[PDB]
Amino acid sequence: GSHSMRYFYTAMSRPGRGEPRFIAVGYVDDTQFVRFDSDAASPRMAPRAPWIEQEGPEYWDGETRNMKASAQTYRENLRIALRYYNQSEAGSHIIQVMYGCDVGPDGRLLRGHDQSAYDGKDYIALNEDLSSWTAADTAAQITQRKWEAARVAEQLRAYLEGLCVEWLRRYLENGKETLQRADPPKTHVTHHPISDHEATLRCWALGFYPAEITLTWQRDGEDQTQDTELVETRPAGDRTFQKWAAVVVPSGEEQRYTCHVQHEGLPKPLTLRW
């Protein structure tokens, strides 16, 4: 399906350096649209995309109040996690949360998500049924029992099927110029000799949106997966993304190699060569 909305919370303890910092960020697809930082001079939910600015004061006041209350609760969760793992109050720890909804082309819910981590490890996740939980260890099992008693899965389900999808659909309309526009990569192959006997071929994809893309090298029509250096897709800073893939090839054999590019913005996959 077509689209996602996601909120990401990070809460970071720092004993001796004040209360834990709380940072919240919201995305539609690969476009960030809000932020909150508890360390800011004046912490508030703040716009990070043009199409959200039009929301009125009640929107912004409500999101700010929610994030402040969340920051308080996540401070308590850090204290709790300390007890569940028999940990001292001198170390620095992190809770992270990701939640949100995926919708298809017609805008109906495809699936919901709600996952939490402690110190970068899975802690507790809502299952795809939006009714049951997967706890990673015996500490998270305590949280599971509490959340089962308090019908937390039911609340999440009501939000994921209702408000999450409705607000996502509204953002997608308000931001239709950008959120509903794919920018195809601009592509080329560069050649960097390394010795008399070898050279690197590097296949580039630039200026594309959304981030999802496949770049692959074939030698004589056969995928070179094990022999390709492929860098992480990286943000350009103008909403768009860049990636490259490279292969070390024997001198004179460059024409046996072909770069293949798939992206939602392209009417069909591309084949390039040097």
């Binding site: 919240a24 969340s70 609760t73 308590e76 969760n77 709790i80 509490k146 937390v152």
Partner: peptide
């Protein structure tokens, strides 16, 4: 818009 439960879930 963020999830906003009446009582926010504690661990």
């Amino acid at each position: 818009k963020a999830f906003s439960p009446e009582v926010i879930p504690m661990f």
